[model samples]
Target: TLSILVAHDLQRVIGFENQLPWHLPNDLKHVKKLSTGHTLVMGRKTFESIGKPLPNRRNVVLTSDTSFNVEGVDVIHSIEDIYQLPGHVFIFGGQTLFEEMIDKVDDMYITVIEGKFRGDTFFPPYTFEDWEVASSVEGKLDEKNTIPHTFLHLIRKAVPR
Candidate 1:
């Protein structure tokens, strides 16, 4: 299964100054649990921003630079290469990467933050008319994370395979 894993605010704002605008520990934990053993595909800038490969997962970076390589990372030069990966794959991203792979992914796990935020980057535009809400889980409110957030799992109803 190929999916998209991302968190954005109510306004669909995802990044501010290349960083997540909010500090939501619950959302971070959620991401870790879901993507731990799967293949994570991201753009080079995203990978670079993370500094190192996330542990216990297959990290793949999509880049135009042919010589780009990192230890414990698979660098692929084309979108078609994503199909050859093993097990469930998650498109872990930056805006450009999300825009490129949005139509290609089978499912999307979106964490919707209820707060308002200003961001330079936003999640790519796509209609949810053909998507079915598979599940919706509200995040727990606590001292570490007071922001209201809901994790939504969406499956594509119809699209070219």
Candidate 2:
């Protein structure tokens, strides 16, 4: 199965200029727990932001160019190649990559932060007709300074057939 996970704000924006302003410990913990021992796929920038391959998880980085490299991250040229991986795969993205794989995704984990900010990147608009909210939790980051956010687990119900 393929899952697309993201943490965004009320504007549906995920990043500003190319970076995320706040961090959610719970979301990270959830991601690590869910994706560990499986595959975590991401675009080059996302991999760079995190700075290293997530321990224990098979890191799959999508890149159109061939120059980038990390010790344990497996860089692939296309989504079709990712589809050929052994088990469940998580598509963690920037913007373009998410848009590219949304149609093929089976599930989504979105963290919707309460505040809105100017941003250059956003998650694709999701609708109830094609997806269903499996679960949701409203919470704040562990740190006192971080913004309030809501975590949602969504599963795709139907798509163009």
Candidate 3:
């Protein structure tokens, strides 16, 4: 099962200066709960953003440069055949990885923040009409981040083969 975990603001800003602009401890906790035992697939840039392989999970990095390698991280040349990925997988990304995998994903765990900010990176364009909201939580002000955010679970409509 392949899924994407993303967080965005009203402006669709996902990253700033190669990192997330804000930190919401609650959302971070959600990420941990979902991805703890799953495999995380991300692009090279996304891996660099975190500075090291995330602990207690399998970190797989997609990169064009085959020479790149890191301890405890699985490095693949591209995302062209991610179907080969085994087990529960989460696409934890930078901008490019999301665009490459969006159409092939089955589920999305999204955090929609009710605020705006300046950012250089954004999530790939997507349509809500293509997904059925499986669940959502009412928005609330997060004192740590000082922003209102909503957590959502959306499943892409099944396509008949």
Candidate 4:
């Protein structure tokens, strides 16, 4: 099974120039805690945004080009290839990959940054009717860039495969 890892503003803006517009260290830690030692599936663009493969985890990059290869990384042509993998997984994004795989993943680890931010790429629109907040926690709003973010663990209604 795979869960999606996401952070976005009120308008669903997720990226600007291939990177996040906000840098919340707390949210970074949250990602590490949840994804460490597990498989992280990402599109080629998202993998390139990181510049290199992440360490201590199995990194799977999805791409249609068979010639593109990276050392210490696994490459697949499609999201369906994830089922061939052996263990747990999570996904990080660019924009296209998220849209393509939205219905495939069952869970989401989302961080909603509590302010409007400028960005070119936006997360795909979603409705509350499709998912429920399984759990939540509020981040501290304080001095020195302590952006108050809400972490939500969302579970989508199951669809029989």
Candidate 5:
């Protein structure tokens, strides 16, 4: 199954300076829980933000440049290659990938924070009304995480063939 894992604000801002605008340890934990053993597909900037392969997961970079390479990471030039990958796949984005892959996503793991933020990258506008909420968890405001947020698991409703 193909899915997208992302965290954005109420205004839909997801990135700033090629990195997440906020530091929420709880949300990071949620990401690890869902994607630990699955395949993570991301754009070049998103991969660069992390600086290295996320341990215990298969890291795949979807880039337009066919010559791009990173040790221990698989780089594919076409979206067609995504369908050929094994197991569950997660599109970890930097805006461009999210826009391109949104239509093909079977599920979405979105962390919607309660405030507006400064960001250069945004998740493309999506019609959430068509997706079913499979599960939801509200994050607590604690010492480590200050802002209010919610983790949402959304599954796409069946479409007519």
Candidate 6:
């Protein structure tokens, strides 16, 4: 089964000024686990926000323009190319990418934060009729003033062929 793991803020927003704070331990661990031996699809902005190539996975960055360059990461210009990659794929986001692929995504691993932050991006709203919550975990950040977020795993119901 192909899985599309998504980890975002409680507000469903993803970016602020071209970067995201890569400080959530749980979310990092989740991404690490989900992408260990799989393909990850993301936008160019998301790739930049990551700062460096994520080890142990094939990084596929989507861009409308063909000018992005980063060592060790494959850059594609369309969703069709992303689907042609092997193995399970996770559509890591920068808002626009997630919104565009939400219908084709098989599963979503989301982190709902306790508070909302000021941001310029947001995730699209989903419905229960098409998706089902598979699992969930709630946690508060340690005393280091990080984000307190709840983790959820949602799976899309299969349709009859």
Q: Which residue runs of candidate 1 sit more than 4 Å off their true CA positions?
A: 159-161
Winning candidate number (lDDT): 5
- On TM-score, the candidate that comes out on top is 5
lDDT by residue (14-132, candidate 4, tens digit) is: 98888889978888888888888998888888888889988888999999999988998999997778778778888788688789778888889899998898899887888878998
Rate residue 27 of model 6 by lDDT: 71
Give per-model CA RMSD: 2.1, 2.2, 1.9, 2.3, 1.5, 2.4
**Candidate 3 lDDT by residue in tens digits, 51-145:** 99989988999988878989999988867657788888998987888888888899999999778888999988788889999999955564576
| Positional deviation of residue 112's Cα in model 1 after best superposition, in angstroms | 0.2
TM-score of 1: 0.94
Clashing pairs in 5: none
TM-score ranking, high to low = 5, 1, 3, 4, 2, 6
Provide the TM-score for each candidate, comma-separated.
0.94, 0.89, 0.92, 0.91, 0.95, 0.86
Cα-based RMSD of candidate 5? 1.5
Candidate 3: regions farther than 4 A off:
139-142, 159-161
List the lowest-lDDT window of 10 residues for candidate 2: 138-147
TM-score of 2: 0.89
Q: Which run of 10 residues does model 3 get worst, by summed lDDT? A: 138-147
Pairs in steric clash, model 4: none
In the range 51-106, model 1's lDDT, one tens digit per residue, is 99999999999999988979999999998999999899999998988898888899
Of 4 and 6, the candidate ranking higher by TM-score: 4
lDDT of each: 0.91, 0.84, 0.86, 0.86, 0.92, 0.77
